[PDB]
């Protein structure tokens, strides 16, 4: 189960990089794909008991969905907390 | 069953006053509270159809968990974010 939670939370890590990728550019579906998958990876983790982890998947699924609806000005803001929390929780 | 959401997103409003409050008095046994009621409410916003509220409901959780971790200052603009989107979606 540590495992399991520690290779999700490198899964988010992961998404969230492709996540900055794709809004460097105009990729509008994979910004609604990457939220759907992060939407599941939070469910995942809320069933595994933890709830500080599926927070910062949820935090980078509203970052996703912030920058695919027009405001890519606040939606940096939260990538950068999430990063911050999931490097925390990882070590 | 929209009537419900809109009173739903009036409650997570007055929740986000009472945060908001409840900060600059260095309470710790409100805000776990708090975020134990917003997690709920983001639980019934899931199984009543509607991500974008509990996307909201979750960010103020996720502000209500940072001020009582002792980061204070991200909590600030997560607030602003959330109080936006509950504005734009209680109309
Ligand atoms: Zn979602
Ligand atoms: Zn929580």
Same mark, same amino acid.
């Given at each position: 189960?540590?495992?399991?939670?520690k290779?999700?939370?490198?899964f988010?890590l992961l @998404?969230?990089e492709?996540?900055?990728?794709?809004?460097? #550019? /105009?990729? $509008? =579906?994979?910004?609604?794909?990457?939220? &759907?998958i992060?939407d599941?990876?939070?469910?995942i983790?809320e069933?595994?008991?933890?709830?500080?982890?599926a927070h910062?998947a949820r @935090?980078?699924?509203?970052?996703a969905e912030?920058?695919? #609806? /027009?405001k $890519? =000005?606040?939606?940096?803001?939260l990538? &950068?907390?999430?990063?911050?929390?999931?490097?925390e929780?990882?070590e």
């Amino acid at each position: 189960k540590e495992e399991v939670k520690k290779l999700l939370a490198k899964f988010v890590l992961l @998404l969230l990089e492709m996540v900055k990728r794709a809004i460097k #550019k /105009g990729d $509008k =579906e994979t910004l609604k794909l990457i939220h &759907e998958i992060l939407d599941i990876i939070a469910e995942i983790f809320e069933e595994l008991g933890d709830d500080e982890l599926a927070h910062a998947a949820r @935090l980078v699924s509203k970052a996703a969905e912030l920058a695919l #609806k /027009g405001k $890519k =000005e606040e939606a940096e803001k939260l990538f &950068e907390i999430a990063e911050e929390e999931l490097k925390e929780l990882i070590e």
